[PDB]
Write a protein that binds this ligand. Structure first.
Ligand SMILES: CC(C)=CCC/C(C)=C/COP(=O)(O)OP(=O)(O)O
Ligand SMILES: [Mg+2]
Length: 297
C-alpha cells in the first residue's frame, strides 16, 4: 500500500513538471485556464501519457497545447469519456463559456460501443484571445464502420471520398470557447504498408516527391482532414525526434523548440504536422511539433 501512495504522489508531480517545463520554456506567464487542465491531469490516477506541442506560424509560437492519453490497461473508455467531459464542464463554469458538444453527441449517438475504442485523449489549446481557445478530444475506433460513416457525414465535405474510410481510425473534436466546434478525420498509413503497390496507387502518387521523403524516418503517416484546416495537414510519426532536422527544413522558431526538446527526459518518438506546400519550400514556415512522456505506476 505504501509503495502505491509514494508512486501516486510521484506521478502527480512528474505530470505537473512535464507541463511546467513546456510552459516555462515558451510562455513566461501561463495562459489561463492552464491550472484547470493541471487539476484534470492530477485527478487521473491510472497510467497515462501526456502530449506537449507547439504550433509555429512564421515567428509566432503557440505553446499552451497539451493532451492527456488514457492508458490504464482496464480499458474503461466510458469512464474516461465522462472524466474528460466533467473537466470540460468545469472549464465552462470557471471561464463562463458554453461549449458546443453537437459534433461529439452526434458521433457518439445513442448506442456507442466503447469496446471498439483503442485511444482516448483530452486536452487544450489555450490562447490570449478567449474566443480562439479550445478544448480537444480524440477517439480512435477499430472495426466500427457505422461510426466512420457518421464522422464522414459530420465533416461537411472535408473528408474527401468514401475510399478514405479504408484509412481512418482516429476522429478528432475541437471545442472553441466561442461556441464554434469542429471535427477532424485522420487517414493513416502504417509503416508495414509503405512499399505496397495498393498504397502507391491509392495514396503516394497523389503526393509530390517532397511529401514522400520523411517516410524514411517515420513509423506512421497521416493526413488530417477538417474544414477548420486551410490545407490538409500531413503528419509524420518520427521514430526518433533527433531526426527532425534531417528531414524537415526548420525556421528559427521551430529550431528553438527542437533544441529545447533534444535533451529533455521524454519519449524517443514525436509527431510532425505540416501542409504539403511547406515541404515544397526551401524552408518550412508553418509547422506543428508534438512531444510525449508516459507516466506508469
Ligand atoms: C495515428 C494518428 C492519425 C495520430 C494523430 C497524431 C497527431 C499529431 C494529431 C494532431 O492532433 P490535432 O489535429 O488535434 O492537433 P492541432 O491542434 O495541431 O490541429
Ligand atoms: Mg487538427
Amino acid at each position: 500500500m505504501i509503495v502505491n501512495v509514494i508512486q501516486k504522489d510521484r506521478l502527480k508531480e512528474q505530470k505537473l513538471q512535464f507541463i511546467r517545463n513546456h510552459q516555462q520554456a515558451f510562455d513566461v506567464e501561463p495562459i489561463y485556464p492552464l491550472p484547470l487542465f493541471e487539476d484534470f491531469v492530477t485527478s487521473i490516477e491510472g497510467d497515462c501519457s501526456l502530449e506537449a506541442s507547439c504550433k509555429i506560424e512564421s515567428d509566432k509560437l503557440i505553446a499552451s497545447r497539451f493532451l492527456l492519453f488514457f492508458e490504464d490497461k482496464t480499458q474503461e473508455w466510458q469512464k474516461y469519456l465522462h472524466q474528460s467531459l466533467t473537466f470540460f464542464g468545469l472549464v465552462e463554469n470557471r471561464v463562463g463559456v458554453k461549449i458546443n458538444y453537437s459534433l461529439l453527441q452526434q458521433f457518439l449517438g445513442s448506442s456507442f460501443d466503447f469496446s471498439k475504442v483503442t485511444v482516448l485523449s483530452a486536452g487544450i489549446d489555450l490562447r490570449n484571445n478567449l474566443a480562439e481557445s479550445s478544448l480537444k478530444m480524440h477517439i480512435r475506433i477499430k472495426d466500427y464502420p457505422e461510426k466512420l460513416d457518421k464522422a464522414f457525414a459530420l465533416s461537411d465535405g472535408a473528408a474527401d471520398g468514401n475510399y478514405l474510410k479504408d484509412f481512418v481510425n482516429l476522429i478528432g473534436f475541437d471545442f472553441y470557447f466561442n461556441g464554434k466546434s469542429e471535427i477532424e478525420i485522420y487517414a493513416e498509413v502504417q509503416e508495414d504498408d509503405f512499399f505496397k503497390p495498393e498504397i502507391n496507387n491509392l495514396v503516394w502518387q497523389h503526393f509530390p516527391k517532397t511529401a514522400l521523403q520523411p517516410l524514411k524516418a517515420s513509423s506512421l503517416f497521416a493526413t488530417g482532414l477538417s474544414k477548420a484546416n486551410n490545407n490538409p495537414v500531413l503528419y509524420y510519426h518520427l521514430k526518433n525526434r533527433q531526426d527532425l532536422t534531417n528531414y524537415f527544413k526548420l525556421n528559427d522558431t521551430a529550431q528553438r523548440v527542437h533544441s529545447f526538446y533534444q535533451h529533455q527526459d521524454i519519449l524517443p518518438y514525436m509527431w510532425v504536422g505540416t501542409a504539403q506546400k511547406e515541404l515544397e519550400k526551401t524552408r518550412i514556415e508553418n509547422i506543428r511539433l508534438y512531444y510525449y512522456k508516459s507516466f506508469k505506476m
